[PDB]
Design a protein around this ligand. Structure first.
Ligand code: HEM
Ligand SMILES: CC1(C)C[C@H]2C=C(C(=O)O)[C@@H]3COC(=O)[C@]4(CO4)[C@]23C1
Length: 397
């Protein structure tokens, strides 16, 4: 008897930690220690998907004496309207109501066209440069920040100002750096709201300003803008890096995709399913039980913390035959859980899929000899950031 402790070690740079797969083989739910509170860890696909749809399991903490959280985690929860359990129902409902129509089919069609040209230009610059090159800096970072500049209606050079703010805000290791970065985000966004009130354009804050005959306060509008900026590029960057590494590891699949770029949507879905880095602490969705819930023979009690392991569930053999294998020829694969499920299902997921499809339609057709310029084992997943990620990806081509 040894209580497992999150985070678990992973001897590889990607995939699921061996002890989490061990727990998944035993059963769907286990009690575990963490760096803070103990929690229920749910690792099988069926059970994670069912609990993500359970309205008794919520982001907010209902406990009278809530455990302490890092400044980074507190900011994340507040941007998601989860910081007060008594107001979460109304505030979270309004959050989704106001954000979902900012990603209409009209906007996404226009953005797809611009995204495709931008990737073409990014890869032309990459192809003309002399290796070794940092693929993370000149491709993975540049496309999603271009997209956020478009959503916010700001010059592309602004991403040189805000491009590290998601990392800094979500630095769990330094509460002072986290709070100081978040203040820069707030200042920038309040500046942008004030500008869009006199100079609106085809962009998200202009639409929120116009909403309901101007019923929203500037602080309400900026709060929504901060969520778009802080959630809307960094995780996509990480998926471009992980998708590149996964395809480099699977040359038969990579050659299939180079030959037929019509396989890109299927490759993107496999990349999202399998793309988990380092110890994979970002591939857990955190919840608290607001009422008792039974999972198998296990009772989750009101107030208990729950970690829904979307990464491990996406590797679950019960849901994906040979769940550890990258296979873009899967016939009717189950819907993966990398965007979540249920009440908080990712708002940007259709846009994120457009970006990743445009990249992997083009990458290995444009750079057929692309490969790492350093060993995989030298690539360092950044465990202290809520969103993880690699800091650099050196390549040759
Ligand atoms: C591949 C890239 C992305 C991944 C893997 C991802 C993943 C996720 C996941 C798993 C959640 C659920 C969190 C939870 O249930 O607690 C979520 C929520 C969210 N995502 Fe995404 N996301 C991505 C890109 C984006 C983009 C591009 C945007 C906007 C431009 C965005 C905006 C949001 C927002 C606002 C939420 C909060 C939803 C809510 O709390 O109701 N995300 N994302
Ligand atoms: C809003 C989020 C940025 C989306 C989700 C994906 C993430 C990631 O891929 O890094 C974030 C990690 O931390 C979380 O609690 C998550 C899993 O819900 C995320 C919060």
């Amino acid at each position: 008897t040894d209580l497992p402790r999150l985070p678990f070690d992973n001897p590889d740079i990607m995939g699921i930690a061996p002890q989490m797969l061990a727990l998944q083989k035993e059963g769907p739910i286990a009690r575990v220690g963490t760096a803070g509170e103990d929690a229920w860890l749910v690792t099988r696909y069926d059970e994670v998907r069912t609990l993500l749809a359970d309205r008794r399991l919520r982001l907010s903490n209902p406990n009278p004496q809530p455990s302490a959280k890092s400044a980074a985690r507190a900011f994340m929860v507040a941007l998601m309207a989860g910081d007060d359990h008594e107001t979460e129902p109304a505030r979270h409902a309004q959050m989704r109501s106001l954000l979902i129509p900012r990603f209409s089919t009209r906007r996404l069609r226009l953005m797809k066209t611009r995204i495709e040209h931008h990737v073409d230009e990014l890869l032309d610059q990459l192809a003309a440069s002399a290796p070794p090159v940092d693929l993370h800096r000149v491709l993975s970072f540049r496309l999603p920040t271009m997209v956020v500049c478009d959503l916010l209606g700001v010059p592309l050079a602004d991403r040189e100002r805000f491009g590290q703010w998601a990392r800094g805000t979500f630095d769990q290791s330094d509460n002072e750096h986290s709070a100081n970065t978040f203040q820069q985000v707030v200042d920038y966004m309040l500046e942008l709201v004030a500008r869009k009130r006199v100079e609106p354009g085809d962009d998200i804050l202009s639409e929120l300003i116009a909403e309901k005959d101007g019923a929203l306060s500037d602080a309400d509008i900026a709060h929504l803008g901060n969520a778009v900026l802080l959630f809307g590029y960094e995780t996509t960057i990480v998926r471009i890096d992980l998708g590149t590494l996964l395809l480099l590891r699977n040359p038969v699949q990579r050659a299939q995709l180079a030959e037929d770029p019509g396989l890109a949507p299927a490759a993107v879905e496999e990349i999202l399913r399998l793309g988990v880095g380092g110890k994979g602490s970002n591939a857990l969705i955190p919840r608290y039980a607001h009422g008792d819930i039974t999972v198998g023979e296990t009772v989750i009690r009101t107030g208990d913390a729950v970690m829904l392991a979307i990464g491990a569930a996406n590797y679950d053999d019960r849901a994906f035959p040979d769940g550890g294998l990258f296979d873009l020829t899967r016939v009717r694969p189950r819907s993966h859980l990398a965007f979540g499920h249920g009440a908080r299902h990712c708002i940007g997921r259709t846009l994120a899929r457009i970006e990743l499809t445009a990249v992997f339609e083009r990458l290995f057709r444009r750079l057929p000899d692309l490969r790492l310029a350093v060993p995989e084992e030298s690539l360092r997943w950044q465990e202290h950031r809520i969103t993880g990620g690699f800091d650099e990806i050196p390549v040759t081509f």
